[PDB]
CSV table of C-alpha atoms (C1' of nucleotides) in Angstrom, one decimal:
chain,number,residue,atom,x,y,z
A,110,UNK,CA,0.0,0.0,0.0
A,111,UNK,CA,1.1,3.5,0.8
A,112,UNK,CA,4.7,3.9,2.1
A,113,UNK,CA,3.8,6.7,4.6
A,114,UNK,CA,1.0,4.9,6.5
A,115,UNK,CA,3.2,2.1,7.8
A,116,UNK,CA,3.2,3.6,11.3
A,117,UNK,CA,-0.1,1.9,12.0
A,118,UNK,CA,1.5,-1.4,10.9
A,119,UNK,CA,4.1,-1.2,13.7
A,120,UNK,CA,1.4,0.0,16.1
A,121,UNK,CA,-0.7,-3.0,15.2
A,122,UNK,CA,2.2,-5.5,15.4
A,123,UNK,CA,3.0,-4.6,19.0
A,124,UNK,CA,3.7,-7.1,21.8
A,125,UNK,CA,2.5,-5.3,24.9
A,126,UNK,CA,1.7,-8.1,27.3
A,127,UNK,CA,3.6,-10.9,25.6
A,128,UNK,CA,2.2,-11.5,22.1
A,129,UNK,CA,0.7,-9.8,19.1
A,130,UNK,CA,-2.3,-7.5,18.9
A,131,UNK,CA,-3.8,-9.4,16.0
A,132,UNK,CA,-4.8,-12.5,18.0
A,133,UNK,CA,-6.0,-10.2,20.8
A,134,UNK,CA,-8.4,-8.3,18.4
A,135,UNK,CA,-9.6,-11.5,16.7
A,136,UNK,CA,-10.9,-13.0,20.0
A,137,UNK,CA,-13.3,-11.4,22.4
A,138,UNK,CA,-10.7,-10.6,25.0
A,139,UNK,CA,-11.7,-8.5,28.0
A,140,UNK,CA,-8.2,-7.0,28.2
A,141,UNK,CA,-8.4,-5.8,24.6
A,142,UNK,CA,-11.4,-4.2,22.8
A,143,UNK,CA,-11.7,-1.6,25.6
A,144,UNK,CA,-8.3,0.0,26.0
A,145,UNK,CA,-8.7,1.8,22.6
A,146,UNK,CA,-12.3,3.0,22.9
A,147,UNK,CA,-14.6,4.2,25.8
A,148,UNK,CA,-17.6,3.4,23.6
A,149,UNK,CA,-18.6,-0.1,22.4
A,150,UNK,CA,-19.5,1.0,18.8
A,151,UNK,CA,-16.1,2.8,18.3
A,152,UNK,CA,-14.3,-0.3,19.6
A,153,UNK,CA,-16.3,-2.5,17.2
A,154,UNK,CA,-15.7,-0.3,14.1
A,155,UNK,CA,-12.0,0.0,15.0
A,156,UNK,CA,-11.8,-3.8,15.5
A,157,UNK,CA,-13.4,-4.5,12.2
A,158,UNK,CA,-11.1,-2.0,10.5
A,159,UNK,CA,-7.9,-3.4,12.1
A,160,UNK,CA,-8.9,-7.0,11.4
A,161,UNK,CA,-9.9,-6.5,7.8
A,162,UNK,CA,-6.3,-5.5,6.9
A,163,UNK,CA,-5.5,-9.3,6.7
A,164,UNK,CA,-8.4,-10.1,4.4
A,165,UNK,CA,-8.6,-9.8,0.6
A,166,UNK,CA,-9.8,-6.4,-0.5
A,167,UNK,CA,-12.0,-6.3,-3.6
A,168,UNK,CA,-12.8,-8.9,-6.1
A,169,UNK,CA,-10.1,-11.5,-6.9
A,170,UNK,CA,-8.2,-10.1,-9.9
A,171,UNK,CA,-4.8,-10.7,-11.5
A,172,UNK,CA,-3.7,-8.0,-13.9
A,173,UNK,CA,-2.7,-8.5,-17.6
A,174,UNK,CA,1.0,-7.9,-16.8
A,175,UNK,CA,0.8,-10.7,-14.2
A,176,UNK,CA,1.6,-14.3,-15.2
A,177,UNK,CA,-1.2,-16.8,-15.9
A,178,UNK,CA,-0.1,-20.3,-16.9
A,179,UNK,CA,-2.3,-23.1,-18.3
A,180,UNK,CA,-1.9,-26.4,-16.5
A,181,UNK,CA,-3.4,-29.5,-18.3
A,182,UNK,CA,-5.8,-31.4,-16.2
A,183,UNK,CA,-5.4,-35.3,-16.2
A,184,UNK,CA,-8.6,-35.7,-18.1
A,185,UNK,CA,-9.3,-33.1,-20.9
A,186,UNK,CA,-9.1,-29.9,-19.0
A,187,UNK,CA,-7.0,-26.8,-18.0
A,188,UNK,CA,-6.7,-24.4,-15.1
A,189,UNK,CA,-5.3,-20.9,-15.3
A,190,UNK,CA,-2.8,-20.8,-12.4
A,191,UNK,CA,-2.0,-17.2,-11.8
A,192,UNK,CA,1.0,-17.3,-9.4
A,193,UNK,CA,1.9,-14.7,-6.9
A,194,UNK,CA,5.4,-13.8,-5.7
A,195,UNK,CA,6.0,-15.5,-2.3
A,196,UNK,CA,7.5,-12.6,-0.5
A,197,UNK,CA,7.4,-14.5,2.8
A,198,UNK,CA,9.5,-17.3,1.4
A,199,UNK,CA,12.1,-15.0,-0.1
A,200,UNK,CA,12.3,-13.1,3.1
A,201,UNK,CA,12.8,-16.3,5.1
A,202,UNK,CA,15.5,-17.5,2.6
A,203,UNK,CA,17.0,-14.0,2.6
A,204,UNK,CA,17.3,-14.2,6.4
A,205,UNK,CA,18.8,-17.7,6.3
A,206,UNK,CA,21.3,-16.7,3.5
A,207,UNK,CA,22.2,-13.5,5.3
A,208,UNK,CA,22.9,-15.5,8.5
A,209,UNK,CA,25.0,-18.0,6.5
A,210,UNK,CA,27.0,-15.4,4.6
A,211,UNK,CA,27.3,-12.5,7.1
A,212,UNK,CA,26.4,-14.1,10.5
A,213,UNK,CA,28.8,-13.8,13.4
A,214,UNK,CA,29.2,-17.6,13.9
A,215,UNK,CA,29.5,-18.1,10.2
A,216,UNK,CA,32.3,-15.5,9.7
A,217,UNK,CA,34.0,-16.9,12.9
B,1,C,C1',-1.5,-23.6,-24.7
B,2,U,C1',5.7,-22.9,-22.1
B,3,A,C1',6.6,-17.1,-14.3
B,4,A,C1',2.7,-17.2,-21.0
B,5,G,C1',2.7,-12.7,-24.4
B,6,A,C1',6.4,-7.3,-25.3
B,7,A,C1',11.7,-4.4,-25.5
B,8,A,C1',18.1,0.0,-29.1
B,9,U,C1',22.5,0.8,-23.4
B,10,U,C1',25.3,4.8,-25.7
B,11,C,C1',28.0,9.0,-27.0
B,12,A,C1',33.6,10.6,-25.7
B,13,C,C1',38.9,9.1,-23.6
B,14,G,C1',47.3,9.8,-23.5
B,15,G,C1',48.3,5.4,-18.1
B,16,C,C1',54.0,6.6,-17.7
B,17,G,C1',58.1,8.4,-15.4
B,18,G,C1',62.7,5.7,-12.8
B,19,G,C1',65.3,1.3,-11.2
B,20,C,C1',72.2,-3.9,-10.4
B,21,U,C1',68.0,-9.3,-7.6
B,22,U,C1',72.8,-10.8,-6.2
B,23,G,C1',76.7,-14.3,-2.8
B,24,A,C1',77.9,-19.9,-2.0
B,25,U,C1',77.0,-25.4,-3.4
B,26,G,C1',79.4,-33.4,-4.4
B,27,U,C1',73.2,-36.1,-6.4
B,28,C,C1',74.2,-41.2,-5.2
B,29,C,C1',75.1,-45.9,-4.0
B,30,G,C1',72.7,-51.0,-6.4
B,31,C,C1',70.2,-53.7,-10.7
B,32,G,C1',69.1,-60.5,-15.7
B,33,U,C1',63.4,-57.1,-19.1
B,34,C,C1',62.2,-61.9,-20.8
B,35,U,C1',59.6,-65.9,-23.8
B,36,A,C1',56.8,-67.3,-28.6
B,37,C,C1',55.3,-65.6,-34.3
B,38,C,C1',53.8,-67.1,-42.6
B,39,U,C1',52.8,-60.3,-44.0
B,40,G,C1',49.6,-61.7,-47.8
B,41,A,C1',45.6,-62.0,-48.7
B,42,U,C1',44.5,-63.5,-57.0
B,43,U,C1',47.7,-56.9,-53.7
B,44,C,C1',52.0,-56.1,-60.7
B,45,A,C1',44.2,-54.3,-63.3
B,46,C,C1',50.5,-55.3,-66.5
B,47,U,C1',53.2,-55.2,-71.9
B,48,G,C1',51.9,-55.2,-77.0
B,49,C,C1',48.6,-55.5,-81.3
B,50,C,C1',43.7,-54.8,-85.0
B,51,G,C1',40.8,-50.3,-85.2
B,52,U,C1',40.4,-42.8,-86.5
B,53,A,C1',38.1,-44.2,-82.1
B,54,U,C1',37.9,-42.6,-75.4
B,55,A,C1',33.1,-47.4,-79.4
B,56,G,C1',34.6,-52.3,-79.2
B,57,G,C1',38.0,-56.8,-79.9
B,58,C,C1',42.8,-59.6,-80.0
B,59,A,C1',47.9,-61.5,-78.5
B,60,G,C1',51.5,-64.3,-73.9
RNA sequence: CUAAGAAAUUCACGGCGGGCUUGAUGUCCGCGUCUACCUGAUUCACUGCCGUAUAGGCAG
């Protein structure tokens, strides 16, 4: 999304009492859902807003510049298979490779 | 029906100033290389004659 609104991301990914705010706002926790709003309706609308950030926004669409690859079905058929870039996998492999190539134990 | 489908990197350029690498040196003792074979298979498509002949025959 926007590169200037990422402050709410680090505010939402906080670990105040031991774990993330996401699981706190998914469940009906008494500790959460009241520290942010004095009114119940404000708490509800803020909760739906902060939880819908992990859901798909809009209709499912893959652009023309995106890749779509036919895969032949076993019996007389095809599926379209538009793949998305696994940024989580490349981040995890980047962390592993950075540890292997520039880590303290590795360079030792 | 292919991480599908598409694409101009490119213009210009002084690398050179100079220099002692030299001194010395024991390679070395010893040694059983044997045994047994058909080169030759049409392996000399050769020399001469009749005929203008490359066409085609003939002589030892």
